[PDB]
Amino acid sequence: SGSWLRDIWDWICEVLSDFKTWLKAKLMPQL
């Protein structure tokens, strides 16, 4: 039934979401 610390990836993915949006805007060239 249980596989592993699947929910554990949310502690890093949920907190790194704001960091991704900030980088996605800085990496986007002129459009």
Curated annotation (Swiss-Prot):
Signal peptide: none annotated. It comes from the Viruses. Residues 1-31 dip into the membrane without crossing it. Residues 6-26 are annotated as: Membrane-binding. It is a peripheral membrane protein. Cleaved by host caspases which are probably activated by the viral infection. Ubiquitinated. Ubiquitination by host TRIM22 leads to interruption of viral replication. It is found in: Host endoplasmic reticulum membrane; Host cytoplasm, Host perinuclear region; Host mitochondrion; Host cytoplasm. Cell culture adaptation of the virus leads to mutations in NS5A, reducing its inhibitory effect on replication. Phosphorylated protein that is indispensable for viral replication and assembly. Both hypo- and hyperphosphorylated states are required for the viral life cycle. The hyperphosphorylated form of NS5A is an inhibitor of viral replication. Involved in RNA-binding and especially in binding to the viral genome. Zinc is essential for RNA-binding. Participates in the viral particle production as a result of its interaction with the viral mature core protein. Its interaction with host VAPB may target the viral replication complex to vesicles. Down-regulates viral IRES translation initiation. The N-terminus acts as a membrane anchor. The C-terminus contains a nuclear localization signal. Monomer. Homodimer; dimerization is required for RNA-binding. Interacts with the mature core protein. Interacts (via N-terminus) with non-structural protein 4A. Interacts with non-structural protein 4B. Interacts (via region D2) with RNA-directed RNA polymerase. Part of the viral assembly initiation complex composed of NS2, E1, E2, NS3, NS4A, NS5A and the mature core protein. Part of the replication complex composed of NS2, NS3, NS4A, NS4B, NS5A and the RNA-directed RNA polymerase embedded in an ER-derived membranous web. Interacts with host GRB2. Interacts with host BIN1. This is Non-structural protein 5A. It comes from Hepatitis C virus genotype 1a (isolate H77). The lineage of its organism: Viruses, Riboviria, Orthornavirae, Kitrinoviricota, Flasuviricetes.
